[PDB]
Structure formats: C-alpha cells, structure tokens
mmCIF file with all atom_site columns, C-alpha atoms in Angstrom:
data_model
loop_
_atom_site.group_PDB
_atom_site.id
_atom_site.type_symbol
_atom_site.label_atom_id
_atom_site.label_alt_id
_atom_site.label_comp_id
_atom_site.label_asym_id
_atom_site.label_entity_id
_atom_site.label_seq_id
_atom_site.pdbx_PDB_ins_code
_atom_site.Cartn_x
_atom_site.Cartn_y
_atom_site.Cartn_z
_atom_site.occupancy
_atom_site.B_iso_or_equiv
_atom_site.pdbx_formal_charge
_atom_site.auth_seq_id
_atom_site.auth_comp_id
_atom_site.auth_asym_id
_atom_site.auth_atom_id
_atom_site.pdbx_PDB_model_num
ATOM 1   C CA . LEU A 1 1   ? 0.000   0.000  0.000  1.00 0.00 ? 5   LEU A CA 1
ATOM 2   C CA . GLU A 1 2   ? 0.858   3.659  -0.662 1.00 0.00 ? 6   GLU A CA 1
ATOM 3   C CA . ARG A 1 3   ? 1.861   5.390  2.577  1.00 0.00 ? 7   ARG A CA 1
ATOM 4   C CA . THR A 1 4   ? -0.704  7.608  4.311  1.00 0.00 ? 8   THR A CA 1
ATOM 5   C CA . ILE A 1 5   ? -0.399  11.381 4.628  1.00 0.00 ? 9   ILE A CA 1
ATOM 6   C CA . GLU A 1 6   ? 0.555   10.926 8.291  1.00 0.00 ? 10  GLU A CA 1
ATOM 7   C CA . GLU A 1 7   ? 3.243   8.365  7.436  1.00 0.00 ? 11  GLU A CA 1
ATOM 8   C CA . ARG A 1 8   ? 4.709   10.549 4.690  1.00 0.00 ? 12  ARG A CA 1
ATOM 9   C CA . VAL A 1 9   ? 4.825   13.677 6.847  1.00 0.00 ? 13  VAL A CA 1
ATOM 10  C CA . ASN A 1 10  ? 6.419   11.515 9.540  1.00 0.00 ? 14  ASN A CA 1
ATOM 11  C CA . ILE A 1 11  ? 9.187   10.514 7.096  1.00 0.00 ? 15  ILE A CA 1
ATOM 12  C CA . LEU A 1 12  ? 9.777   14.156 6.241  1.00 0.00 ? 16  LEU A CA 1
ATOM 13  C CA . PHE A 1 13  ? 10.056  15.051 9.934  1.00 0.00 ? 17  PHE A CA 1
ATOM 14  C CA . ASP A 1 14  ? 12.712  12.333 10.289 1.00 0.00 ? 18  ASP A CA 1
ATOM 15  C CA . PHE A 1 15  ? 14.590  13.539 7.181  1.00 0.00 ? 19  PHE A CA 1
ATOM 16  C CA . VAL A 1 16  ? 14.669  17.183 8.309  1.00 0.00 ? 20  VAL A CA 1
ATOM 17  C CA . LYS A 1 17  ? 15.539  16.298 11.901 1.00 0.00 ? 21  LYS A CA 1
ATOM 18  C CA . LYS A 1 18  ? 18.483  14.252 10.632 1.00 0.00 ? 22  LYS A CA 1
ATOM 19  C CA . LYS A 1 19  ? 19.767  17.091 8.402  1.00 0.00 ? 23  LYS A CA 1
ATOM 20  C CA . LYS A 1 20  ? 19.790  19.332 11.476 1.00 0.00 ? 24  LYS A CA 1
ATOM 21  C CA . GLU A 1 21  ? 21.513  16.754 13.665 1.00 0.00 ? 25  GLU A CA 1
ATOM 22  C CA . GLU A 1 22  ? 24.189  16.052 11.045 1.00 0.00 ? 26  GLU A CA 1
ATOM 23  C CA . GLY A 1 23  ? 25.152  19.735 10.881 1.00 0.00 ? 27  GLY A CA 1
ATOM 24  C CA . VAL A 1 24  ? 24.180  20.401 7.268  1.00 0.00 ? 28  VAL A CA 1
ATOM 25  C CA . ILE A 1 25  ? 20.702  21.915 7.537  1.00 0.00 ? 29  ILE A CA 1
ATOM 26  C CA . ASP A 1 26  ? 21.820  25.462 6.594  1.00 0.00 ? 30  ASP A CA 1
ATOM 27  C CA . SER A 1 27  ? 22.839  24.203 3.113  1.00 0.00 ? 31  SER A CA 1
ATOM 28  C CA . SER A 1 28  ? 20.080  21.580 2.722  1.00 0.00 ? 32  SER A CA 1
ATOM 29  C CA . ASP A 1 29  ? 17.067  23.679 1.747  1.00 0.00 ? 33  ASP A CA 1
ATOM 30  C CA . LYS A 1 30  ? 16.894  22.251 -1.776 1.00 0.00 ? 34  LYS A CA 1
ATOM 31  C CA . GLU A 1 31  ? 17.314  18.701 -0.485 1.00 0.00 ? 35  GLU A CA 1
ATOM 32  C CA . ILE A 1 32  ? 14.422  19.204 1.922  1.00 0.00 ? 36  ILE A CA 1
ATOM 33  C CA . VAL A 1 33  ? 12.162  20.565 -0.823 1.00 0.00 ? 37  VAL A CA 1
ATOM 34  C CA . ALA A 1 34  ? 13.069  17.574 -3.025 1.00 0.00 ? 38  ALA A CA 1
ATOM 35  C CA . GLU A 1 35  ? 12.284  15.098 -0.247 1.00 0.00 ? 39  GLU A CA 1
ATOM 36  C CA . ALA A 1 36  ? 8.950   16.769 0.479  1.00 0.00 ? 40  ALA A CA 1
ATOM 37  C CA . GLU A 1 37  ? 8.132   16.565 -3.230 1.00 0.00 ? 41  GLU A CA 1
ATOM 38  C CA . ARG A 1 38  ? 9.161   12.865 -3.387 1.00 0.00 ? 42  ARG A CA 1
ATOM 39  C CA . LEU A 1 39  ? 6.862   12.168 -0.467 1.00 0.00 ? 43  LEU A CA 1
ATOM 40  C CA . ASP A 1 40  ? 4.014   14.231 -1.982 1.00 0.00 ? 44  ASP A CA 1
ATOM 41  C CA . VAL A 1 41  ? 3.772   16.437 1.131  1.00 0.00 ? 45  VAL A CA 1
ATOM 42  C CA . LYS A 1 42  ? 5.236   19.575 -0.333 1.00 0.00 ? 46  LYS A CA 1
ATOM 43  C CA . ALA A 1 43  ? 2.727   21.946 1.278  1.00 0.00 ? 47  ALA A CA 1
ATOM 44  C CA . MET A 1 44  ? 3.544   20.553 4.752  1.00 0.00 ? 48  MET A CA 1
ATOM 45  C CA . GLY A 1 45  ? 7.196   21.525 4.402  1.00 0.00 ? 49  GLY A CA 1
ATOM 46  C CA . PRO A 1 46  ? 6.861   24.685 6.488  1.00 0.00 ? 50  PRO A CA 1
ATOM 47  C CA . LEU A 1 47  ? 5.193   22.856 9.397  1.00 0.00 ? 51  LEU A CA 1
ATOM 48  C CA . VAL A 1 48  ? 8.121   20.419 9.561  1.00 0.00 ? 52  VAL A CA 1
ATOM 49  C CA . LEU A 1 49  ? 10.677  23.239 9.293  1.00 0.00 ? 53  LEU A CA 1
ATOM 50  C CA . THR A 1 50  ? 9.045   25.157 12.142 1.00 0.00 ? 54  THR A CA 1
ATOM 51  C CA . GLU A 1 51  ? 9.093   22.117 14.421 1.00 0.00 ? 55  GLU A CA 1
ATOM 52  C CA . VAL A 1 52  ? 12.739  21.393 13.683 1.00 0.00 ? 56  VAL A CA 1
ATOM 53  C CA . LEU A 1 53  ? 14.153  24.917 13.398 1.00 0.00 ? 57  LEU A CA 1
ATOM 54  C CA . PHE A 1 54  ? 12.070  27.319 15.526 1.00 0.00 ? 58  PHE A CA 1
ATOM 55  C CA . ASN A 1 55  ? 11.993  27.784 19.290 1.00 0.00 ? 59  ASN A CA 1
ATOM 56  C CA . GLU A 1 56  ? 11.870  30.799 21.550 1.00 0.00 ? 60  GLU A CA 1
ATOM 57  C CA . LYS A 1 57  ? 14.480  32.412 19.246 1.00 0.00 ? 61  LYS A CA 1
ATOM 58  C CA . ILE A 1 58  ? 12.028  32.201 16.319 1.00 0.00 ? 62  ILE A CA 1
ATOM 59  C CA . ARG A 1 59  ? 12.547  35.823 15.347 1.00 0.00 ? 63  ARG A CA 1
ATOM 60  C CA . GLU A 1 60  ? 16.294  35.316 14.671 1.00 0.00 ? 64  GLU A CA 1
ATOM 61  C CA . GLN A 1 61  ? 15.523  31.979 13.031 1.00 0.00 ? 65  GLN A CA 1
ATOM 62  C CA . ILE A 1 62  ? 13.116  33.507 10.508 1.00 0.00 ? 66  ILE A CA 1
ATOM 63  C CA . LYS A 1 63  ? 15.986  35.643 9.212  1.00 0.00 ? 67  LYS A CA 1
ATOM 64  C CA . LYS A 1 64  ? 18.490  32.767 9.197  1.00 0.00 ? 68  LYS A CA 1
ATOM 65  C CA . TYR A 1 65  ? 16.205  30.267 7.456  1.00 0.00 ? 69  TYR A CA 1
ATOM 66  C CA . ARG A 1 66  ? 14.260  32.605 5.178  1.00 0.00 ? 70  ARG A CA 1
ATOM 67  C CA . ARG A 1 67  ? 15.494  30.768 2.065  1.00 0.00 ? 71  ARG A CA 1
ATOM 68  C CA . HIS A 1 68  ? 14.368  27.375 3.417  1.00 0.00 ? 72  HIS A CA 1
ATOM 69  C CA . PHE A 1 69  ? 10.844  28.649 3.985  1.00 0.00 ? 73  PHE A CA 1
ATOM 70  C CA . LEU A 1 70  ? 10.639  30.837 0.915  1.00 0.00 ? 74  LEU A CA 1
ATOM 71  C CA . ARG A 1 71  ? 11.203  27.846 -1.362 1.00 0.00 ? 75  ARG A CA 1
ATOM 72  C CA . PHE A 1 72  ? 8.013   26.293 0.046  1.00 0.00 ? 76  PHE A CA 1
ATOM 73  C CA . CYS A 1 73  ? 5.904   29.425 0.625  1.00 0.00 ? 77  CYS A CA 1
ATOM 74  C CA . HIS A 1 74  ? 6.480   31.335 -2.607 1.00 0.00 ? 78  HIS A CA 1
ATOM 75  C CA . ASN A 1 75  ? 3.257   31.300 -4.663 1.00 0.00 ? 79  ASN A CA 1
ATOM 76  C CA . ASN A 1 76  ? 1.910   28.498 -2.473 1.00 0.00 ? 80  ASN A CA 1
ATOM 77  C CA . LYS A 1 77  ? -0.955  29.567 -0.193 1.00 0.00 ? 81  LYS A CA 1
ATOM 78  C CA . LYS A 1 78  ? -1.336  26.028 1.119  1.00 0.00 ? 82  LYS A CA 1
ATOM 79  C CA . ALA A 1 79  ? 2.272   25.967 2.288  1.00 0.00 ? 83  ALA A CA 1
ATOM 80  C CA . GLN A 1 80  ? 1.719   29.364 3.872  1.00 0.00 ? 84  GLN A CA 1
ATOM 81  C CA . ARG A 1 81  ? -1.226  28.041 5.861  1.00 0.00 ? 85  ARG A CA 1
ATOM 82  C CA . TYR A 1 82  ? 1.017   25.225 7.153  1.00 0.00 ? 86  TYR A CA 1
ATOM 83  C CA . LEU A 1 83  ? 3.596   27.828 8.167  1.00 0.00 ? 87  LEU A CA 1
ATOM 84  C CA . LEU A 1 84  ? 0.868   29.515 10.234 1.00 0.00 ? 88  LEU A CA 1
ATOM 85  C CA . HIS A 1 85  ? -0.066  26.220 11.904 1.00 0.00 ? 89  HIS A CA 1
ATOM 86  C CA . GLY A 1 86  ? 3.628   25.757 12.550 1.00 0.00 ? 90  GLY A CA 1
ATOM 87  C CA . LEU A 1 87  ? 3.690   29.129 14.241 1.00 0.00 ? 91  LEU A CA 1
ATOM 88  C CA . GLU A 1 88  ? 0.702   28.145 16.402 1.00 0.00 ? 92  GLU A CA 1
ATOM 89  C CA . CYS A 1 89  ? 2.681   25.099 17.525 1.00 0.00 ? 93  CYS A CA 1
ATOM 90  C CA . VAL A 1 90  ? 5.854   27.057 18.324 1.00 0.00 ? 94  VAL A CA 1
ATOM 91  C CA . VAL A 1 91  ? 3.882   29.537 20.419 1.00 0.00 ? 95  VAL A CA 1
ATOM 92  C CA . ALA A 1 92  ? 2.266   26.616 22.262 1.00 0.00 ? 96  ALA A CA 1
ATOM 93  C CA . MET A 1 93  ? 5.715   25.346 23.271 1.00 0.00 ? 97  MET A CA 1
ATOM 94  C CA . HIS A 1 94  ? 6.930   28.805 24.372 1.00 0.00 ? 98  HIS A CA 1
ATOM 95  C CA . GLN A 1 95  ? 3.754   30.622 25.466 1.00 0.00 ? 99  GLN A CA 1
ATOM 96  C CA . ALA A 1 96  ? 5.142   32.925 28.149 1.00 0.00 ? 100 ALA A CA 1
ATOM 97  C CA . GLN A 1 97  ? 7.842   34.095 25.739 1.00 0.00 ? 101 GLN A CA 1
ATOM 98  C CA . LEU A 1 98  ? 5.976   34.249 22.443 1.00 0.00 ? 102 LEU A CA 1
ATOM 99  C CA . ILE A 1 99  ? 2.284   35.084 22.978 1.00 0.00 ? 103 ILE A CA 1
ATOM 100 C CA . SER A 1 100 ? 2.923   38.833 23.259 1.00 0.00 ? 104 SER A CA 1
ATOM 101 C CA . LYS A 1 101 ? 5.172   38.754 20.189 1.00 0.00 ? 105 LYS A CA 1
ATOM 102 C CA . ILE A 1 102 ? 2.595   37.366 17.753 1.00 0.00 ? 106 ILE A CA 1
ATOM 103 C CA . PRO A 1 103 ? 1.898   40.541 15.757 1.00 0.00 ? 107 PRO A CA 1
ATOM 104 C CA . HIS A 1 104 ? 5.613   41.291 15.413 1.00 0.00 ? 108 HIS A CA 1
ATOM 105 C CA . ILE A 1 105 ? 6.475   37.732 14.346 1.00 0.00 ? 109 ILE A CA 1
ATOM 106 C CA . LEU A 1 106 ? 3.660   37.906 11.788 1.00 0.00 ? 110 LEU A CA 1
ATOM 107 C CA . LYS A 1 107 ? 5.045   41.190 10.466 1.00 0.00 ? 111 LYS A CA 1
ATOM 108 C CA . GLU A 1 108 ? 8.505   39.643 10.155 1.00 0.00 ? 112 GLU A CA 1
ATOM 109 C CA . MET A 1 109 ? 7.136   36.662 8.239  1.00 0.00 ? 113 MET A CA 1
ATOM 110 C CA . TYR A 1 110 ? 5.095   38.965 5.990  1.00 0.00 ? 114 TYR A CA 1
ATOM 111 C CA . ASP A 1 111 ? 8.114   41.209 5.386  1.00 0.00 ? 115 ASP A CA 1
ATOM 112 C CA . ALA A 1 112 ? 10.265  38.170 4.483  1.00 0.00 ? 116 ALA A CA 1
ATOM 113 C CA . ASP A 1 113 ? 7.632   37.249 1.849  1.00 0.00 ? 117 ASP A CA 1
ATOM 114 C CA . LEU A 1 114 ? 6.694   34.034 3.670  1.00 0.00 ? 118 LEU A CA 1
ATOM 115 C CA . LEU A 1 115 ? 3.009   34.876 4.147  1.00 0.00 ? 119 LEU A CA 1
ATOM 116 C CA . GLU A 1 116 ? 0.611   36.716 1.870  1.00 0.00 ? 120 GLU A CA 1
ATOM 117 C CA . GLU A 1 117 ? -1.873  39.256 3.219  1.00 0.00 ? 121 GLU A CA 1
ATOM 118 C CA . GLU A 1 118 ? -4.939  37.239 2.182  1.00 0.00 ? 122 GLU A CA 1
ATOM 119 C CA . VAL A 1 119 ? -3.649  34.023 3.759  1.00 0.00 ? 123 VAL A CA 1
ATOM 120 C CA . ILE A 1 120 ? -3.037  35.777 7.095  1.00 0.00 ? 124 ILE A CA 1
ATOM 121 C CA . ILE A 1 121 ? -6.475  37.433 7.112  1.00 0.00 ? 125 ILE A CA 1
ATOM 122 C CA . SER A 1 122 ? -8.151  34.128 6.158  1.00 0.00 ? 126 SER A CA 1
ATOM 123 C CA . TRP A 1 123 ? -6.314  32.225 8.885  1.00 0.00 ? 127 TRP A CA 1
ATOM 124 C CA . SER A 1 124 ? -7.271  34.846 11.455 1.00 0.00 ? 128 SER A CA 1
ATOM 125 C CA . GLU A 1 125 ? -10.979 34.426 10.665 1.00 0.00 ? 129 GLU A CA 1
ATOM 126 C CA . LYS A 1 126 ? -11.125 30.618 10.741 1.00 0.00 ? 130 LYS A CA 1
ATOM 127 C CA . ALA A 1 127 ? -11.483 28.156 13.607 1.00 0.00 ? 131 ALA A CA 1
ATOM 128 C CA . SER A 1 128 ? -8.567  26.153 14.981 1.00 0.00 ? 132 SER A CA 1
ATOM 129 C CA . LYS A 1 129 ? -7.480  23.347 12.676 1.00 0.00 ? 133 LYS A CA 1
ATOM 130 C CA . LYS A 1 130 ? -6.720  21.356 15.845 1.00 0.00 ? 134 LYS A CA 1
ATOM 131 C CA . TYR A 1 131 ? -2.959  21.862 16.086 1.00 0.00 ? 135 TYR A CA 1
ATOM 132 C CA . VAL A 1 132 ? -3.301  23.629 19.408 1.00 0.00 ? 136 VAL A CA 1
ATOM 133 C CA . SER A 1 133 ? -5.962  24.032 22.109 1.00 0.00 ? 137 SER A CA 1
ATOM 134 C CA . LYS A 1 134 ? -9.014  26.040 20.956 1.00 0.00 ? 138 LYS A CA 1
ATOM 135 C CA . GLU A 1 135 ? -8.334  28.477 23.800 1.00 0.00 ? 139 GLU A CA 1
ATOM 136 C CA . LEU A 1 136 ? -4.769  29.144 22.658 1.00 0.00 ? 140 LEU A CA 1
ATOM 137 C CA . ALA A 1 137 ? -5.841  29.387 19.012 1.00 0.00 ? 141 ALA A CA 1
ATOM 138 C CA . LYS A 1 138 ? -8.290  32.082 20.102 1.00 0.00 ? 142 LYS A CA 1
ATOM 139 C CA . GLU A 1 139 ? -5.659  33.962 22.078 1.00 0.00 ? 143 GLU A CA 1
ATOM 140 C CA . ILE A 1 140 ? -3.151  33.865 19.206 1.00 0.00 ? 144 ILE A CA 1
ATOM 141 C CA . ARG A 1 141 ? -5.763  35.416 16.910 1.00 0.00 ? 145 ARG A CA 1
ATOM 142 C CA . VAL A 1 142 ? -6.578  38.160 19.412 1.00 0.00 ? 146 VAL A CA 1
ATOM 143 C CA . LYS A 1 143 ? -2.880  38.994 19.651 1.00 0.00 ? 147 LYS A CA 1
ATOM 144 C CA . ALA A 1 144 ? -2.740  39.039 15.824 1.00 0.00 ? 148 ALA A CA 1
ATOM 145 C CA . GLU A 1 145 ? -5.413  41.731 15.644 1.00 0.00 ? 149 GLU A CA 1
ATOM 146 C CA . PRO A 1 146 ? -3.115  44.783 15.618 1.00 0.00 ? 150 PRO A CA 1
ATOM 147 C CA . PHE A 1 147 ? -1.172  43.396 12.641 1.00 0.00 ? 151 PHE A CA 1
ATOM 148 C CA . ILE A 1 148 ? -4.338  42.422 10.755 1.00 0.00 ? 152 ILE A CA 1
ATOM 149 C CA . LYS A 1 149 ? -5.570  45.993 11.219 1.00 0.00 ? 153 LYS A CA 1
ATOM 150 C CA . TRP A 1 150 ? -2.203  47.310 10.006 1.00 0.00 ? 154 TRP A CA 1
ATOM 151 C CA . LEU A 1 151 ? -2.555  45.087 6.921  1.00 0.00 ? 155 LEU A CA 1
ATOM 152 C CA . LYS A 1 152 ? -6.029  46.414 6.111  1.00 0.00 ? 156 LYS A CA 1
ATOM 153 C CA . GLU A 1 153 ? -4.684  49.890 6.907  1.00 0.00 ? 157 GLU A CA 1
ATOM 154 C CA . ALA A 1 154 ? -6.936  52.248 8.987  1.00 0.00 ? 158 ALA A CA 1
ATOM 155 C CA . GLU A 1 155 ? -10.428 50.546 8.832  1.00 0.00 ? 159 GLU A CA 1
ATOM 156 C CA . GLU A 1 156 ? -11.748 47.101 9.592  1.00 0.00 ? 160 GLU A CA 1
ATOM 157 C CA . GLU A 1 157 ? -13.739 45.128 7.029  1.00 0.00 ? 161 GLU A CA 1
ATOM 158 C CA . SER A 1 158 ? -13.719 41.347 7.052  1.00 0.00 ? 162 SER A CA 1
ATOM 159 C CA . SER A 1 159 ? -12.590 39.009 4.347  1.00 0.00 ? 163 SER A CA 1
ATOM 160 C CA . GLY A 1 160 ? -13.990 35.586 3.558  1.00 0.00 ? 164 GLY A CA 1
ATOM 161 C CA . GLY A 1 161 ? -12.008 32.920 1.773  1.00 0.00 ? 165 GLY A CA 1
ATOM 162 C CA . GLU A 1 162 ? -12.279 29.218 1.189  1.00 0.00 ? 166 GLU A CA 1
ATOM 163 C CA . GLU A 1 163 ? -9.301  26.937 1.718  1.00 0.00 ? 167 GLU A CA 1
ATOM 164 C CA . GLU A 1 164 ? -8.065  24.234 -0.608 1.00 0.00 ? 168 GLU A CA 1
ATOM 165 C CA . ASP A 1 165 ? -6.780  21.350 1.429  1.00 0.00 ? 169 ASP A CA 1
ATOM 166 C CA . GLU A 1 166 ? -6.693  18.005 -0.492 1.00 0.00 ? 170 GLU A CA 1
ATOM 167 C CA . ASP A 1 167 ? -4.675  15.909 2.021  1.00 0.00 ? 171 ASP A CA 1
ATOM 168 C CA . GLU A 1 168 ? -6.451  15.525 5.343  1.00 0.00 ? 172 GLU A CA 1
ATOM 169 C CA . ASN A 1 169 ? -5.614  18.178 7.858  1.00 0.00 ? 173 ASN A CA 1
ATOM 170 C CA . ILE A 1 170 ? -6.207  15.685 10.666 1.00 0.00 ? 174 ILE A CA 1
ATOM 171 C CA . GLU A 1 171 ? -3.515  13.353 9.368  1.00 0.00 ? 175 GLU A CA 1
ATOM 172 C CA . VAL A 1 172 ? -1.005  16.199 9.516  1.00 0.00 ? 176 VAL A CA 1
ATOM 173 C CA . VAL A 1 173 ? -2.226  16.994 13.014 1.00 0.00 ? 177 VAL A CA 1
ATOM 174 C CA . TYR A 1 174 ? -1.503  13.413 14.099 1.00 0.00 ? 178 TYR A CA 1
ATOM 175 C CA . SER A 1 175 ? 1.991   13.548 12.582 1.00 0.00 ? 179 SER A CA 1
ATOM 176 C CA . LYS A 1 176 ? 2.713   16.877 14.309 1.00 0.00 ? 180 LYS A CA 1
ATOM 177 C CA . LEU A 1 177 ? 1.400   15.665 17.658 1.00 0.00 ? 181 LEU A CA 1
ATOM 178 C CA . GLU A 1 178 ? 3.878   12.802 17.391 1.00 0.00 ? 182 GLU A CA 1
#
C-alpha cells in the first residue's frame, strides 16, 4: 500500500531532523524541498521546518532560514497556511515568551515574503485546525489583531475565503502531535 499522509509527513520530519543533527541543515534547503516533493507532502514543508528549526528564538531563526521557507511558501498559499499552523505550535511550546510577540512575528514573516496578506487574514478568521488548544488558538488570533488591522490599513472590514486542502488536515495533526 501507498503510505498515508501521516506516514509521509512523519518521514519528512525524520529527514529534516536528521539534516539538522548532522550539521548540514543550513545548506540543505533544496534537499528538503526535493524530499517533500518525493513524499508528496510539499505543502507541509513549512510545518516540519518550524518544528525542527524554531523555538523561543524564532525571530532570529526567521531571518536565518528565510530561504528554506521561501522555497516552500512562494506562490503556495497552502504551504503558507502550514507555516501559520507551525507558528501556532511554536507559540504553544513557548507561550510565556511568544504570545505577546505574535503581531511582530507575523510582520517579520510577511516582510520576508513568507506569508501573503490574504492568507493571514483568512487564517485569522477561521477556527482552529486542531494543532493547538481552541483556547490558545483564540488567544493567538486576538494577539494578531493589531497586525491584521495594520494590513487592512486604517479601517476594519472582514474578508472571507475558502481553503483548498486536499490531504487531510487531521492526518497532519496526528503527525505533528507525534
């Protein structure tokens, strides 16, 4: 049998973790993209990168690893949504440190071309996709509000978008929770 979405994401986690451990991750961005493509989990690339690369120093790490993320996120709104779920997960691990920083981290990701305006707005309006507690998901989105307002400029109208997510989200949740 073909491997499941969960299994394939799991293999990508292992691959990326091993690149980091071996000391070559900084020069392995293309190798990681290729492995994600081989495994047909390209859009999940950013979620794996966040888990492996980001901690409480996420703001420095966004600069350092911009190229790794950009290769996935560029012209790929699905990959961008997975980056946002990745961010949810990093905040969950480092809440005291990171919760207050959400709008500034979002701005840094936006400025690095890793997230498009419409993806961020959409994500802000939608329920938790189950990566983190509903309560934390809510709090993250409240903290996002000042940046969302900055994005829209000086006025607040709401967007409304539909997502395109072929693979199941819940499978990726299981892989992440592992």
